[PDB]
């Protein structure tokens, strides 16, 4: 069909992307103005209608995309499903979920990420970098769980606001890890009752700050190489060898070329 | 002309650079002494005249440079325009701009950076490294904007000093990100009214600290390679291949040399 | 023997690993529920019996492993000795050691690390990375010891809570290093009595934060390469050349191939 | 001479190094015990004599080294001059310097670094890494000086404890940079009088934390490669090409080998 063809040409254009980006910024700005409690009844009603206009433009946009690519074709992309959910969640007459309320209309600004390709690639790098740090994130989870059970048993009876239960302990252990008032606010007061409390919190700080930094460095380094390798694949179209694989087999590739040079020289000297 | 030639020879000399560097340090030191409110009327007038002398030396310096290189030639360098603005801004009888006042004469010490070539190269590395982190900086901007709108709507009515409006929220979210009294000062008090506030601030901390570190690591790594590659171009004069490009095509260059070795060996065995 | 053979086949299976992992999570969860002081007598007795069941399953598991591999074969692995100690420590009718009490049954959750191979490899990377940072860790130890002796002599008489003895000084120096209330809580108050105290604490902060970061970066970078090289050895089975050795001899390997190319070209031109 | 020869053989032995290391630890431990104000007159006199014994052993050690290597030969090493000063400074009957007092006998423990070769190499890596970060350290110095002059002029009259003079401003700007109570303790109070103070402190934090991290990453990366390259030179004895030089010329070395392969193949096909 010619109708689905020219609609895709329109959707894939730079101006269409710019119009949709402009509407996201406009929706974002109206939601920001609506945080102002002093605004008049007319000013609020006006901005709410501008929010309604922005929302309807997105319904036209998504419906135009579903028709032009097909239900299966549109939903083949994770970015499209995200775009679909962000907009479709607004058209909901009552929902039965384990969430508070959908008053967070501002999450629509997250579409700037999906609509801008350079920003889409950054998040892509970060998400693809997550599986590779799963074991470190799990190790940190185990350290926190063990630590929380210990802290609850040791300090909960004497310090109930900070360690009274497992939930309170997880919260103040996260605070200790971020180094936030860990000594003047938590451990110096706890040491006044339990003088050897530093045997618990100092190794806890040393271990968690090292593991967290490991988790962050792991993500930053992979995400940086993934984003870079994706660009070399979104230019040449050829598959890019992962930098780690190049580095692992570098020595192997060097001795093979060395040995092939000597045997070629061995046959060259005697002809 | 012989006048413009010998003036360039003088300007490009090591001693001329040292004289101008000495005057910048002297101007910087007099402005530092002038922060002392206890000083006598004579001492203040004296230092203000030494500041005036330093300023006039810079007017001679820039005018000497404009004549020796030509208006177009001088203004071709961004460092020269910066040097021009820093000095020309002082000779201003009233200005109509969206700024407070030009009492910040101390910004003249920033000329140490433009006048010292090693320091000029460091800032150059840092500035050239900025475009490459634009998408991460934009992602962090979007996270802050979404977060500020949420925090204003959720906590502004109960916590007006910290979240009363969009501006107050952006400020305390920047504080939370820097881990400054985030729990003892902000979130433990907010949890006394909103017990699930940690569902907001803990993921906000996790996401922003990771993104900020990504932004900083990105800048530090590029700036380091740019400064290094600039030096290999300011020695040999030959263009230096970016380290990333060397790394991306390393595997490709290795299999090409491997394949050329085997085909050469294939023709060598049968002659 | 056929009995020891089929028992090893069972132990090395994926389902056996999953059953033992399930029991660790179950034991971990019951120990977490037991931190709740409000629980009834029946609820506590019940969970204590579920803890007892979990413990006995581990005694069956280890005994099954000792028989199937032999005492020497089982104890050949450091992970097995760790698994043995974690379980065998529970079956102890009074012990004479320089420890408080074995109420930390929650340390049994650390078995998730030894039982899950990806998690076992992460800790392995981290432990093997420790010898290489021993000199930096020793340098930081020497800085802390010298600093503590100084701080005790200088500030102990005027500030006994923070510097009264060597132990109190080591503790507040660790706090200063983590940047926790170092100025508003410790150094601004100390400067009210000793105005040049900043000559001590600012260089102490500068030196220790740099050394700690060196210690952490050192561990993170090695552990990352060790874990990666271990995987290339737990796939191909061939020994992986350490990335540092590849990098050190890279220039050497390149000039050797360059020189062999020119001499081959020298003999090729004249035949 | 045979006397100077066998004395060098003794000095260069492992046991001699161990004896001197034992005496440093012993001296360090006695100085630590002497921080205890509760000690009796006899206990103090005893430890002071053990300190005196340790000091005399070092005088024998250095004098033995000066004779065995010669005045010029001994003083040729920077580590020896350091060892000489640390010991010779103790034998001083009154000194006229811009220092407080030589009560810091504990600085003798810094000899553990010079006496242990692995620890000596770590400090060597760190010291040799300093010239390369001189421009970044200078940039950070200029930012602090400009910032201190601004802060004194803007906030000194309203906030004299924190910004009353140039010295007070440098101190609280260093505190702000370390993120220590920067908002709850300094900027929220300053904003109550100067509402746009965040325009000053937020860009100051952003710029200084980035520059400091640049300074630290710069030192850690060079020191790590220097220590590594020094070891490859203290094993093979051959000069090690700096990793940066290997990386810069990697692309250049690859295209030269590529071009030499094609021209060799061009002559091989037609013989
Ligand atoms: C720190 C980055 C790094 C890595 C590397 C080391 C040896 C190789 O053969 C290939 C890659 C590296 C890079 C990324 C890694 O994973 C990131 C997320 N997993 C934690 C793991 C290792 C490295 C380490 C030392 C020298 C050169 C590169
Ligand atoms: C962390 C530096 C790094 C990089 C790299 C990875 C693969 C390549 O083919 C070329 C460069 C790298 C270096 C700088 C980068 O950009 C810095 C600013 N953008 C966020 C992005 C990636 C890297 C990652 C893993 C192993 C070796 C180098
Ligand atoms: C930061 C990692 C690194 C390293 C390197 C530098 C030169 C070499 O010939 C081989 C390895 C490196 C990697 C890990 C090191 O040890 C980690 C634990 N010891 C402190 C030490 C150095 C490096 C530094 C500069 C460029 C490329 C890699
Ligand atoms: C971060 C280390 C690094 C570096 C590098 C980049 C390109 C080269 O041709 C040679 C070395 C590097 C390593 C150390 C440097 O100096 C450390 C102290 N000066 C600030 C500067 C740059 C680098 C950056 C990107 C990819 C691979 C290595
Ligand atoms: C090259 C991109 C990449 C990886 C990479 C990124 C930066 C580096 O400096 C080195 C390796 C990568 C990241 C993590 C990996 O394993 C982590 C261990 N698994 C638990 C394996 C490969 C990768 C490869 C396949 C899938 C996802 C990421
Ligand atoms: C080699 C200098 C360089 C870059 C570089 C610096 C250090 C590395 O370890 C790897 C790459 C660089 C930096 C960032 C780049 O892309 C970031 C993604 N764009 C949003 C691409 C290249 C660069 C190249 C062209 C223009 C500006 C910087
Ligand atoms: C390759 C794994 C490895 C090392 C390594 C990891 C990551 C890198 O980027 C560069 C080197 C390593 C780590 C530390 C080493 O020496 C530190 C100085 N000794 C005090 C020597 C080698 C190693 C080698 C042998 C035993 C243990 C670790
Ligand atoms: C290889 C050791 C080295 C350097 C190095 C260390 C680690 C790397 O990843 C890349 C380079 C080094 C460090 C800093 C350099 O320049 C910084 C800019 N000068 C202001 C130049 C070279 C060096 C070289 C000569 C003297 C001192 C240090
Ligand atoms: C750098 C490595 C960390 C140094 C280790 C710190 C030593 C802890 C010793 C210590 O401070 N206490 C003495 C235990 O008897 C416990 C506390 O009671 C004490 O700090 C009081 O101030 C409260
Ligand atoms: C490491 C991952 C972070 C751990 C997650 C923390 C759990 C938060 C649970 C919790 O603390 N609350 C119970 C919610 O019912 C909310 C607060 O009310 C409570 O902290 C009070 O102390 C105030
Ligand atoms: C960035 C590099 C660090 C800057 C260095 C800070 C200068 C310290 C000078 C100074 O503040 N004092 C004056 C010494 O005479 C000591 C204190 O007494 C003073 O701070 C009072 O506020 C208390
Ligand atoms: C993440 C980027 C940083 C966000 C920028 C923060 C906006 C600052 C706006 C603001 O807070 N003020 C309004 C200026 O009119 C100044 C202060 O007066 C105010 O914070 C009061 O709470 C005191
Ligand atoms: Na901090
Ligand atoms: Na704090
Ligand atoms: Na803090």
B183 and A179: CB-CB below 8 Å? no
B109 and D210: CB-CB below 8 Å? no
Which residue in this structure is represented by tokens 């100077």?
Answer: D4
Residue D159: DSSP 8-state: -
Kindly list the partner chains of chain A, i.e. chains with 3 or more CB atom pairs below 8 Å.
B, C
A269 and C264: CB-CB below 8 Å? no
**Pick from B144, C223, B248, C221: which is nearest to A227 by CA?**
B248
Measured CA to CA, the distance from residue B68 to residue D86 in angstroms comes to: 56
Measured in angstroms, the resolution is 2.6
Q: Which two tokens stand for residue D135?
A: 């421009």
D210 and B219: CB-CB below 8 Å? yes
Q: Which two tokens stand for residue C231?
A: 């995987």
Residue B132: DSSP 8-state: G
Kind plus residue range of the DSSP H or E element containing C227: helix C198-233
Ligand 9 pocket member A191 (CB < 6 A): yes
Among the bound ligands, the one closest to the CA of C247: 3
Three-state SS string across chain A, please? Answer: CHHHHHHHHHHCCHHHHHHHHHHHHHHHHHHHHCCCCCCCHHHHHHHHHHHHHHHHHHHHHHHHHHHHHCHHHHCCCHHHHHHHHHHHCCCCCCCCCCCCCCCCHHHHHHHHHHHCHHHHHHHHHHHHCCHHHHHHHHHHHHHHHHHHHHHHHHHCCCCHHHHCCHHHHHHHHHHHHCCCCHHHHHHHHHHCCCCCCHHHHHHHHHHHHHHHHHHHHHHHHHHHHHHHHHHHHCCCCCCCCCHHHHHHCHHHHHHHHHHHHHHHHHHHCCC
- Out of C106, C181, C220, the one facing A213 most closely (by C-beta) is C220
Measured CA to CA, the distance from residue A80 to residue A99 in angstroms comes to: 23
CB A223 within 8 A of CB A126: yes
Note whether B182 contacts A: Cβ–Cβ < 8 A: yes
Q: Which atom of ligand 3 is nearest to the CA of C129?
A: 18
Contacts for A191 with CB less than 8 Å, ≥ 6 apart: A197, A198
**Pick from B101, B90, B105, B102: which is nearest to B47 by CA?**
B105
Measured CA to CA, the distance from residue A52 to residue A43 in angstroms comes to: 14
Task: Look at residue D242 and give its three-state secondary structure.
Answer: coil
- Out of D28, D175, D257, the one facing C145 most closely (by C-beta) is D28
Enumerate residues 134 to 173 of chain B having a beta carbon within 8 A of any beta carbon in chain A: 134-136, 138-139, 142, 145-146, 149-150, 152-153, 156-157, 165-166
Residue of B nearest to D208 (CA): B216
D146 and B109: CB-CB below 8 Å? yes
Q: Which two tokens stand for residue B56?
A: 């006039």
Min Cα distance C147 → chain D (Å) is 9
List the end-to-end C-alpha distance of chain A, in Å, as a whole number. Answer: 69
Measured CA to CA, the distance from residue B230 to residue B127 in angstroms comes to: 13
CB C181 within 8 A of CB C175: yes
Closest protein CA for atom 11 of ligand 8: D244
- Out of B135, B180, B261, the one facing A119 most closely (by C-beta) is B135
Q: What is the dihedral of CA C193, C199, C202, C207, to 10 degrees?
A: -140
Among the bound ligands, the one closest to the CA of A125: 5
Estimate to the nearest angstrom the gap between the alpha carbon of B242 and the chain centroid: 22
A251 and C232: CB-CB below 8 Å? no
Contacts for B112 with CB less than 8 Å, ≥ 6 apart: B21, B24, B25, B28, B119, D138, D142
Estimate to the nearest angstrom the gap between the alpha carbon of C203 and the chain centroid: 30
Q: Which atom of ligand 5 is nearest to the CA of A226?
A: 2
Distance in Å, CA A248 to ligand 1 centroid? 10
Task: Look at residue D158 and give its three-state secondary structure.
Answer: coil
Measured CA to CA, the distance from residue C130 to residue C137 in angstroms comes to: 9
CB C32 within 8 A of CB A145: yes
Kindly list the partner chains of chain D, i.e. chains with 3 or more CB atom pairs below 8 Å.
B, C
Measured CA to CA, the distance from residue B214 to residue A224 in angstroms comes to: 9
Note whether A44 contacts C: Cβ–Cβ < 8 A: no
A182 and C180: CB-CB below 8 Å? yes
Q: What is the dihedral of CA D244, D249, D251, D256, to 10 degrees?
A: -160
Measured CA to CA, the distance from residue B110 to residue C202 in angstroms comes to: 25
Pocket of ligand 4 from Cβ distances under 6 Å: B 221, 224-225, 228, 243; D 132-133, 218, 221-222, 244, 247-248
Residue of D nearest to B185 (CA): D184
Relative orientation angle of helices B134-155 and A14-33, to the nearest 10 degrees: 30
Contacts for C116 with CB less than 8 Å, ≥ 6 apart: A135, A138, C17, C21
Kindly list the partner chains of chain B, i.e. chains with 3 or more CB atom pairs below 8 Å.
A, D
C184 and D180: CB-CB below 8 Å? yes
Q: Identify how the structure was determined.
A: X-ray
Task: Look at residue C215 and give its three-state secondary structure.
Answer: helix
Which residue in this structure is represented by tokens 């979920």?
Answer: A97
Measured CA to CA, the distance from residue D206 to residue D229 in angstroms comes to: 35
Distances from the Cα of D98 to the Cα of B85, B232, D95, D102, angstroms: 43, 44, 10, 12
Range of the domain at A87: 2-131
Q: Which two tokens stand for residue C129?
A: 């990375």
Min Cα distance B122 → chain D (Å) is 7
Closest protein CA for atom 27 of ligand 1: C243
D241 and C258: CB-CB below 8 Å? no
Min Cα distance A96 → chain C (Å) is 29
Phi, psi of B4 (to 5 degrees): -70, -30
A183 and C179: CB-CB below 8 Å? no
Contacts for B113 with CB less than 8 Å, ≥ 6 apart: B119, B120, B122, B123, D139, D142
Min Cα distance C106 → chain D (Å) is 35
List the end-to-end C-alpha distance of chain C, in Å, as a whole number. Answer: 69
Min Cα distance A173 → chain C (Å) is 15
**Pick from D234, A259, A229, A254: which is nearest to C247 by CA?**
A254
Q: Concatenated DSSP letters for B152-211? A: HHHHTTT-HHHHSSHHHHHHHHHHHHTTSSIIIIIIHHHHTTSTTTHHHHHHHHHHHHHH
Enumerate residues 195 to 254 of chain B having a beta carbon within 8 A of any beta carbon in chain D: 216, 219-220, 223-224, 228-229, 232, 240-241, 243, 245-246, 250, 253
CB contact burial A57-93 (16+ within 10 A = b; e otherwise): bbeebbeebeebbeeeebeeeeebeebbebbeeeeee
Measured CA to CA, the distance from residue D41 to residue A143 in angstroms comes to: 49
CATH number at residue B26: 1.20.120.350
B35 and D265: CB-CB below 8 Å? no
C220: chain A residues, CB-CB within 8 Å: 210, 213-214, 217
Measured CA to CA, the distance from residue B13 to residue B61 in angstroms comes to: 13
Note whether D178 contacts C: Cβ–Cβ < 8 A: yes
Neighbours of C193 (CB within 10 A): 11
Estimate to the nearest angstrom the gap between the alpha carbon of B99 and the chain centroid: 20
Note whether A75 contacts B: Cβ–Cβ < 8 A: no
Instruction: Count how many residues are written for chain C.
Output: 271
Chain breaks in chain B (C to N over 2.5 A) after: none
**Burial status of residue D184 (CB atoms within 10 A of its CB: 0-12, 13-18, 19 or more):** middle
Measured CA to CA, the distance from residue D254 to residue A246 in angstroms comes to: 15
Q: Which two tokens stand for residue B59?
A: 């007017």
**Taking CB atoms and an 8 Å cut-off, how many pairs form between chains A and C?**
112
Ligand 2 pocket member B133 (CB < 6 A): yes
Question: How many CA atoms does the CB half-sphere of A131 hold within 13 Å?
Answer: 4
B198 and A35: CB-CB below 8 Å? no
Choose one of D183, D189, D191 to mutate for the ligand 12 pocket test, by most ligand atoms within 8 angstroms of C-beta: D191
List the end-to-end C-alpha distance of chain D, in Å, as a whole number. Answer: 69
**Burial status of residue B3 (CB atoms within 10 A of its CB: 0-12, 13-18, 19 or more):** exposed
Which residue in this structure is represented by tokens 């032995």?
Answer: D13
Note whether D271 contacts B: Cβ–Cβ < 8 A: yes
Q: Which two tokens stand for residue A69?
A: 């690519």
Q: Concatenated DSSP letters for B107-129? A: GGGGHHHHHSHHHHHHHHHHHHT
**Taking CB atoms and an 8 Å cut-off, how many pairs form between chains A and B?**
112
- Pick the residue of A27, A28, A99, A106 with the most B CBs within 10 A to test the interface with B by mutation: A106
Q: Concatenated DSSP letters for C133-181? A: GHHHHHHHHHHHHHHHHHHHHHHTTT-HHHHSSHHHHHHHHHHHHTTSS
Choose one of A212, A221, A246, A252 to mutate for the ligand 1 pocket test, by most ligand atoms within 8 angstroms of C-beta: A221
Min Cα distance C143 → chain D (Å) is 8
Q: Which two tokens stand for residue A19?
A: 């119009």
B182: chain A residues, CB-CB within 8 Å: 178, 180
Contacts for C242 with CB less than 8 Å, ≥ 6 apart: C225, C229
C135 and D118: CB-CB below 8 Å? yes
Relative orientation angle of helices C134-155 and C198-233, to the nearest 10 degrees: 160
**Burial status of residue D76 (CB atoms within 10 A of its CB: 0-12, 13-18, 19 or more):** exposed
Neighbours of C61 (CB within 10 A): 19
């Amino acid at each position: 069909s010619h109708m689905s063809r020219k609609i895709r040409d329109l959707i894939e254009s730079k101006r269409f992307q710019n119009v949709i980006t402009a509407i996201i910024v406009l929706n974002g700005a109206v939601l920001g103005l609506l945080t102002d409690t002093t605004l008049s009844a007319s000013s609020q009603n006006l901005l709410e209608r501008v929010d309604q206009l922005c929302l309807t433009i997105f319904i036209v946009e998504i419906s135009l995309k579903i028709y032009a690519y097909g239900v299966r074709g549109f939903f083949r992309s994770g970015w499209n499903l995200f775009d679909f959910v962000i907009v479709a969640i607004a058209l909901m007459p009552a929902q039965g979920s384990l969430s508070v309320l959908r008053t967070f209309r501002i999450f629509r600004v997250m579409r700037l990420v999906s609509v801008i390709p350079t920003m889409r690639r950054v998040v892509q790098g970060m998400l693809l970098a997550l599986p590779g740090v799963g074991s470190v994130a799990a190790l940190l989870t185990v350290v926190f769980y063990i630590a929380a059970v210990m802290a609850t048993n040791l300090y909960g009876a004497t310090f109930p606001e900070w360690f009274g239960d497992l939930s309170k302990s997880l919260y103040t252990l996260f605070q200790v890890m971020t180094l936030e008032s860990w000594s003047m606010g938590i451990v110096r007061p706890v040491m006044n009752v339990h003088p050897n409390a530093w045997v618990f919190f100092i190794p806890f700080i040393m271990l968690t700050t090292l593991t967290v930094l490991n988790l962050f460095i792991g993500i930053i380094v992979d995400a940086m190489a993934i984003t870079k390798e994706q660009e070399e694949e979104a230019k040449t179209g050829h598959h890019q060898e992962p930098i780690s694989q190049t580095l692992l087999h570098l020595g192997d590739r060097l001795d093979r070329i060395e040995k092939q040079l000597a045997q070629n020289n061995e046959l060259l000297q005697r002809q």
